[PDB]
Amino acid sequence: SGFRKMAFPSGKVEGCMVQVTCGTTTLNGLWLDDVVYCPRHVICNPNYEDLLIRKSNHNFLVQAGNVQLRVIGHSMQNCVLKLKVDTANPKTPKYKFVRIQPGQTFSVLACYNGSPSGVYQCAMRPNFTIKGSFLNGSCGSVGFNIDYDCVSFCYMHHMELPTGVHAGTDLEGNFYGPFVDRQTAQAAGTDTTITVNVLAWLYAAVINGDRWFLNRFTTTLNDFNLVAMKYNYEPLTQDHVDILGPLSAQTGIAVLDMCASLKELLQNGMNGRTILGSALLEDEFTPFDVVRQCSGVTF
Amino acid sequence: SGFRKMAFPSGKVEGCMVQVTCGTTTLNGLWLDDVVYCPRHVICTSEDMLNPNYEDLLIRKSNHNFLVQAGNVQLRVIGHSMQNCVLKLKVDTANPKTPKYKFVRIQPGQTFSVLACYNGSPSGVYQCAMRPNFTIKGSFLNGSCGSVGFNIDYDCVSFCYMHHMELPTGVHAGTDLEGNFYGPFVDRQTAQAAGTDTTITVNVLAWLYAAVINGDRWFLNRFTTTLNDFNLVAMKYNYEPLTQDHVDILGPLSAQTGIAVLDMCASLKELLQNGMNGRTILGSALLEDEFTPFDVVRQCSGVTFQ
Numbered sequence: 292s293g294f295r296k297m298a299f300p301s302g303k304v305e306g307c308m309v310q311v312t313c314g315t316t317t318l319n320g321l322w323l324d325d326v327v328y329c330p331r332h333v334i335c336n337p338n339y340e341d342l343l344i345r346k347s348n349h350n351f352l353v354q355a356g357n358v359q360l361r362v363i364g365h366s367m368q369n370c371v372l373k374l375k376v377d378t379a380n381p382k383t384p385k386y387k388f389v390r391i392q393p394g395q396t397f398s399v400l401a402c403y404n405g406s407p408s409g410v411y412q413c414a415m416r417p418n419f420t421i422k423g424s425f426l427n428g429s430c431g432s433v434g435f436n437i438d439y440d441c442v443s444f445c446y447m448h449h450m451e452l453p454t455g456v457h458a459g460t461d462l463e464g465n466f467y468g469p470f471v472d473r474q475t476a477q478a479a480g481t482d483t484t485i486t487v488n489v490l491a492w493l494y495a496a497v498i499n500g501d502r503w504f505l506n507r508f509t510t511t512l513n514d515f516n517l518v519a520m521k522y523n524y525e526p527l528t529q530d531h532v533d534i535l536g537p538l539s540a541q542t543g544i545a546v547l548d549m550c551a552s553l554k555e556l557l558q559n560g561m562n563g564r565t566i567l568g569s570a571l572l573e574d575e576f577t578p579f580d581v582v583r584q585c586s587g588v589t590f
Numbered sequence: 591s592g593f594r595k596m597a598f599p600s601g602k603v604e605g606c607m608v609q610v611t612c613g614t615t616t617l618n619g620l621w622l623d624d625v626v627y628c629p630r631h632v633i634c635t636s637e638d639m640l641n642p643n644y645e646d647l648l649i650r651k652s653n654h655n656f657l658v659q660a661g662n663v664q665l666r667v668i669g670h671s672m673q674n675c676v677l678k679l680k681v682d683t684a685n686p687k688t689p690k691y692k693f694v695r696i697q698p699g700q701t702f703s704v705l706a707c708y709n710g711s712p713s714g715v716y717q718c719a720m721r722p723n724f725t726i727k728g729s730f731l732n733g734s735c736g737s738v739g740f741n742i743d744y745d746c747v748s749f750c751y752m753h754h755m756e757l758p759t760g761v762h763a764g765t766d767l768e769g770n771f772y773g774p775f776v777d778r779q780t781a782q783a784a785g786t787d788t789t790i791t792v793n794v795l796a797w798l799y800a801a802v803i804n805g806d807r808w809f810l811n812r813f814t815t816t817l818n819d820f821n822l823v824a825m826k827y828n829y830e831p832l833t834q835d836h837v838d839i840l841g842p843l844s845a846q847t848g849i850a851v852l853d854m855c856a857s858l859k860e861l862l863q864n865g866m867n868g869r870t871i872l873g874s875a876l877l878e879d880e881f882t883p884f885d886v887v888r889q890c891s892g893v894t895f896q
């Protein structure tokens with residue numbers, strides 16, 4: 292029993308974190324085989340090709356623990372800088388670079404000066420920001436998931452927006468969202484609630500014994516989406532309904548029956564009650580996260 | 591900016607997790623140097639759990655009855671001893687991944703990270719607090735026994751908890767790494783229940799200071815309170831008494847924000863009376879009590895968003 296915001300074990304990623312220094316900027320890098328990946332703003336209206344051409348390999352100081360790595364090459368891929376080093380990381384795990392979609396969750400290993408500080412779980416918001424916890428020096432910290440024994444790196448931290456939320460790129464340097472890596476006027480767009488995730492968390496509450504919100508009613512997908520659009524909830528698709536199939540079979544509550552419960556919660560509130568110790572509807576657990584935590588999958 | 595329930599990086603602990611088997615029971619062990627620590631109930635059957643005599647059950651076992659597996663490698667047990675509710679299995683190989691570590695016993699209100707494991711393999715990491723009633727609100731399934739709680743302030747791991755059982759209310763009970771239980775619990779399936787739980791007042795105040803540091807002040811008021819009047823009100827909402835030690839401990843956060851501890855207590859009294867009125871504090875509609883004053887200072891900026 293119990294339901295916690297759970298992150299993946301971070302050890303395989305901790306063994307890849309390094310400190311990258313160029314000029315007065317110090318930030319974090321990800322050392323995989325003989326390449327260090329880091330935000331291209333470590334070299335800083337920036338013209339990154341003009342700034343980069345003026346740098347020599349020895350301008351980049353890379354430190355792994357108490358060991359200095361020597362940079363032997365450099366190249367830029369989108370908003371990510373790739374520093375070729377003479378030493379392959381002996382701790383390189385089995386890995387992939389994957390781009391995630393809004394609504395998907397991942398673990399963040401927050402680092403400062405190449406040293407891991409903490410691990411937390413978060414979701415890519417529908418507005419492409421993440422509600423992280425990052426201070427100055429956290430740039431280059433990474434987000435990941437683990438599948439079997441393989442680390443899928445999905446996020447690299449680049450900046451904080453004026454509302455306190457965060458923006459970054461995939462490991463190929465493509466930003467999530469309409470953001471740019473420059474000190475300019477930027478803002479997160481209006482965010483929405485991840486409906487499929489709220490439904491997954493309601494199934495998790497049922498599995499753990501919280502059933503007060505269940506009712507005898509059902510709804511159609513069309514009527515549910517009309518109500519959900521009114522409450523700034525993301526539209527629920529047939530793919531979301533299919534994805535929730537296993538949880539619907541385990542609890543005996545059809546997805547549209549759980550949608551009827553969610554409509555009543557949106558229209559009436561909780562009335563002094565809580566669900567899994569929360570007075571808000573939680574949207575940062577995917578259907579897969581719920582199945583994984585209620586089954587004990589290991590890595 | 592931001593404020594998350596943040597766990598310590600788990601790598602140093604992952605390299606210590608092993609699987610321990612005795613007969614038909616399998617659970618997790620912590621391998622530090624040449625010793626594997628695990629719950630002594632690994633020697634019990636489910637029948638034994640009503641009134642087990644651990645001394646009598648243990649004397650019938652030899653070293654080769656304990657199977658210890660680290661990854662895909664079988665470790666050889668060369669000795670065994672019981673210390674309180676933990677079994678210590680001497681092995682013929684010292685763990686080459688043993689981090690710098692200490693065994694620390696914590697007090698209620700303290701937080702720690704839990705690395706939940708099954709079959710000696712880490713599954714996930716989350717942040718927890720030792721409740722005032724000595725239980726923890728964890729997330730554990732069958733096979734999670736032997737999973738550990740820890741803190742890593744600096745590069746030294748301080749192990750503070752080892753998981754032993756789930757009580758009927760769904761909450762969890764365990765021991766320190768010397769095998770002494772937290773709370774009035776026994777590693778016996780007897781009618782024991784968690785006592786009435788209370789809110790960790792000093793932690794709620796720490797989290798209100800975290801909200802101020804992150805730029806929010808809507809909940810502040812023009813009042814102050816005496817410590818005794820605060821405690822008289824707090825007890826009515828099932829909040830733990832606030833002591834002078836707690837007031838002293840909150841001194842640094844008070845100095846950084848410019849809000850006196852008793853002035854923050856007055857704000858808490860008003861939040862208990864009025865609720866949040868559709869508002870949130872650090873993304874929560876409830877008063878959060880699983881961040882200590884130390885956790886707030888570690889995570890938050892040293893400069894307040896005035």
Ligand SMILES: N#CC1(CS(=O)(=O)N2Cc3ccc(Cl)cc3[C@H](C(=O)Nc3cncc4ccccc34)C2)CC1
Nearest residue numbers: 332425426427429430449450451452453472473474591
């Ligand atoms: N709005 C805002 C702020 C960011 S900034 O203006 O100082 N900043 C502009 C900028 C522009 C583009 C790029 Cl790619 C990076 C960056 C940097 C960046 O965000 N860094 C950080 C990242 N994360 C967490 C931070 C917390 C605190 C200060 C910096 C933080 C620097 C003040 C928070």
Ligand SMILES: N#CC1(CS(=O)(=O)N2Cc3ccc(Cl)cc3[C@H](C(=O)Nc3cncc4ccccc34)C2)CC1
Nearest residue numbers: 292631730731732734735754755756757758777778779
């Ligand atoms: N009430 C209750 C329950 C526990 S039990 O009755 O199966 N159980 C009695 C018991 C008594 C004392 C001792 Cl020391 C160990 C133990 C064991 C124990 O707690 N194991 C576990 C531990 N953690 C999380 C579990 C989740 C699910 C099933 C077992 C879980 C076995 C059913 C939840």
Ligand SMILES: [Cl-]
Nearest residue numbers: 695696697700
């Ligand atoms: Cl303590």
